[model samples]
Target: GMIKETVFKSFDTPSALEQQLASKIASQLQEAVDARGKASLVVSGGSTPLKLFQLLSMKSIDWSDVYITLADERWVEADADASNERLVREHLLQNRASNAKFRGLKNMFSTAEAGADMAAESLSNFPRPFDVVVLGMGNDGHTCSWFPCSAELENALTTQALCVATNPTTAPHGRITLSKSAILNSRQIYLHLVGEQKLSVYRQALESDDVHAMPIRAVLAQRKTPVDVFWSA
Candidate 1:
């Protein structure tokens, strides 16, 4: 049989999945830190990851050696409620993980396009092939800021640069996100999601090859970076 490019794991409860995911991520971070003296993580924001972040924050990992950044960010102030940066700061960057360094996508620039330039430069300072990248999918089959029918979808998926600016037609707020190339460069990629609706979307993405129609398929259908899908219903 041919080997699968993606591994799917289902859980009975959200908390159960979050607990195990946190433990797995903690060990992965520790392994990277032990081997290279430093580690990096890329995370996505949404209600689904809240419990995982809370659990990860309390883990006994070497926080000082771990660098955390977002897979995407809303083009808003750092403290805004809609800001991915704020979500990370309040949830993941606390307790034992407080010492972990963070790089945010939002910048002093007025527009997301300008902020993407600065974000790319800032992210370049971190080491390549990040230790972990946790991603989320929208109900509409979008991942990161790669919204279906968006003008920037092609750029976000094909750009060689680390980050790109996106204006999602189906959602609020302009976004800055790691380009597909950048996300595929990661050592470990996780598609973390919850609920039956998202699972249906995931299944639909798997059955189709139209990445442009459902942006999440860009990640799900890839062979380069193996993705571990953690889902609960």
Candidate 2:
């Protein structure tokens, strides 16, 4: 309930925004680890975070005490091209974060039907109520693949579900996302984006409070964690 949202503007390139953001969040993660002895961070998939992940992975921080998990994961093999886990490895899990504890969401499951067991195992990597969750938005206003009309939308929106599977027809890849309960329990959440189009959509989503219509809107309107939205023109 204490969550407040603020917008940070930077230059017009992903690299420019990523540099500024990585420094701030890296230090924040470091602080949490030092103070609490352990810290858990959630990151969204998609290429938007590639640069940011590269920037953060190289920082001189205690990777061992920091735990890394995904906000959502596609139901694919770890090395599959569509595998978000592969994206994390190539983009974020290198550099200094090589030692960071990682919990994979793709394990012990070959399909969405088996996702429940993997979800339970993921708990060992992340502490209750994440230290931070960084999200990215889709053109359709979806976050974490919780697009409207997705078969799992109801479960994704509820506080009782742990993880639910999504079948984004346009996206081809079905996904498993952290439920609302997991996201709402965080200490902080962030959305990093760019372009005027998204900003405009973001505004519209705020004006309309129906979450399933625009999943990211729910994250904004009912954020239980402090939220920071960073964008570049």
Candidate 3:
């Protein structure tokens, strides 16, 4: 059986899916701002969510009060093409959302391990429970930097720390990621995707609890926070 708070919304087109997702996220961020005076948003980086970022950037919320950051990032310089920080700065943190503050996972330290402590410390100070977390899954069933069979998977899955270092077994570049607890400690969680293969992977992930085999399952199988999945062909 699945968790009680899960919600799935499928769409026929990418434009339709991202537009609605962006709208809902904007409203929720505004809700947090209206009630508490500030909000925080966590997001994953990849080609899949680029449209969503573009659309969300145009949203007319109180951008100055919204704090945005990556759910994970490649341990590269902020200006590197593979850097999630560059992705967010060029796409998500523009238009009306240009004023939104961003805290990147990569810092002055040379390695993910050396930088993790500072990254974790910075994340702890963000507004929480986070107003929203937007997640993207890989074809291999990974999410954030939580890749299958990675050495850091177990600790990142179970740690109380908000962030941790991850060196993926299959993908390039070491990364720093928000731990499972950090991703779960949010008011809203969204799994955004496109394509038929990802839909099939999502189905397979929901059928088991093997987070080591399919790390995204850790987020999908959780009971503490409900994950809303948005998909399109």
Candidate 4:
């Protein structure tokens, strides 16, 4: 019976939205570092975050004091174009933010399941609850590899699990993702989106109650953390 409360901010254009969100995220990271000596950020992949990453990378901060990781990643080699780690490396970890440390989920293991334990071990070094988590939703209403009707959806949505290996029937590549407990545990959650199709899908998720039918509903329907929906058209 929980209804998620959202903070919506619409921009006339994507670049404007990116700059605003970048400033806000940079401020949050700086504040965490000022208070605790370190800050942690978890970001999602795809074209959605490319601009935000570019903008955030240019912000002035002690990026060396920040720990960055992906909200989810494909269980592929680090060099693979499909890898989230690769996207972050090429797009986000440049400029002034080049020194920000990265902890990736893909490793020597053959499958995501085998690598999950090691991924969790690396994540443990980052401060928790995370200072911020930037997440992107698919047109199918999936987020963080928690695809709708996927076998791992229940485990990723329920229980207190921190991470899981996911096999998505609809999406390419096996994936490693932070569980609901892990992502929702963050101090701030930003739902980054663009295009009218996604805006329509996001609205539907908000109205629906079934978390399994639309996996992102699990994030949108929760009362624990308020999700900031940053959208542009």
Candidate 5:
């Protein structure tokens, strides 16, 4: 009942994307910190945020107070280069935000499910209602591995659930992801993306009611939190 979607101009090039996106996010983060003294920010991985990292990391934002981390893990070791951990390490973390508090999906869990539990516990240490949560949508309309039509749906959608291990039928990779509930629990959600195809899928979600089919639809339905959709072609 509180959902809001804002569609902004999609830029033509990655550099232009970095400029506009960082500017907006920097302003928001500054306001959040000024009002609250600290803020938690959840970011999505994928090629889309690469340029965003390049620009955002350099912003004059109060990096030391921001809590930043991925929305999920590919079940690989946290530091593995193939993991999103490494992606952020190479991109944003090394920059100004390097000193911020970061909690990974793999803290001390031997198995993927345990990893999620640790992730939840780790994240719980922060204040509730994140200042911002950036999300990425797949071609299948799935976000954060909340894949539809999967056997793990029971665990993934539980209201209080924080994390779950999923073996998506599409690929055999084990994943440790924050449950749909965890993401919807955020105070604000920002969908960061590129490409016309993804934009089309997200727009379809805006008009459709079948949220179960697209994991992101669950956030839209459950949280009613304002969503900002940023894009580029």
Candidate 6:
């Protein structure tokens, strides 16, 4: 079987989905912290996860023992309006989660390519096979920074490096992203999407085998790690 059997959980409302998903994530992180001394979480940006972050930040987990990082980030200043780091800091790194450490991908380097190595180095101390990774998909079927037909797609999918620079033709900004290798080396993977349009795009991804055309397929199709798709319509 070429494609992995993904677990799909659908909800009638986004708030309801976020409520359950946030609870699940809290429990998972708590378990990880109990087993080890710390837990690591990877989260994606975009407007989709804003509510999820707000809810998750309020959970009564051991935030001091959790390490949070982004799955991808726009190569902009940390305080920039479009910066994923800023988004996370304002939303996720608040409430009870404020004690959790954050590792951002953006650095002082002028270009994403020049910053990738340093970003990878900064994350080297994070627990191997991160405890949780939450990902978001674009309508174009791209996840993380793995944009469809981007020059960096292949390398982002297969390279051994933990982070890579990507320039997406379909979206704005050059991005610093956790490579597929990094994403797959995770204890849990969650694909979060809301709305009918994104759900349709996800369904379309399911029937397609061309990873080049739909980079999200690379994650959905692989058997290495199970993907839990949480969708709302």
TM-score of each: 0.96, 0.91, 0.96, 0.96, 0.88, 0.97
**Candidates' lDDT values, in order?**
0.89, 0.80, 0.90, 0.90, 0.73, 0.92
Backbone clashes (count) for model 6: 0
Expressed as tens digits, the lDDT of each residue in 166-224 for candidate 5 is 76787546777777767777777777777778878877766765656777777755537
For residue 38, model 6's alpha carbon misses the true position, in angstroms, by 0.6
In model 5, the runs with Cα more than 4 Å from the true position are 1-8, 221-223
Q: List model 1 lDDT by residue over 1-233, tens digit each.
A: 21235699999999999999999899999999999999999999988898899999999989999988999999999999999999999999999999898989999999898778889999887867889999999888889999885899999989999999999877999899899999999888889989889888888787776888888888878787778999999
Model 2: per-residue lDDT, tens digit, 1-233?
22245454656777778888888788888889988888888898887888889898999888888888888888888898888889998888898999888886776666775776568555754666788789998878899878885877877888466677777776777688888777878888889987888888777766766887788877887744677888876
**How well is each residue in 58-174 modelled by candidate 6, as lDDT tens digits?**
999999999999999999999999899999999999999999999999999999999999999999999878999999999999999999857999999899999999998878899
Write out the backbone clash pairs for model 2. none
Evaluate model 5: give its lDDT. Answer: 0.73
Give the Å error, residue 84, model 1: 0.7
Q: Judged by lDDT against the true structure, how good is candidate 1?
A: 0.89
Candidate ranking (lDDT, best to worst) = 6, 3, 4, 1, 2, 5
Q: Please give the clash total of every predicted structure, in order.
A: 0, 0, 0, 0, 0, 0
lDDT of 1 at 190: 88
1-233, model 3: which lDDT tens digit per residue? 44344579999899999999999999999999999998999989989889899999999999899988899999999999999999989899889998898999999999999999999888777899999999999989899999885899998999999899988978999999999988999988999989999998888777777788888888888777868899999
Q: State the displacement of the C-alpha of residue 89, model 2, in Å, after optimal TM-score superposition.
A: 0.6
Error of 3 at 193 (Å): 1.1
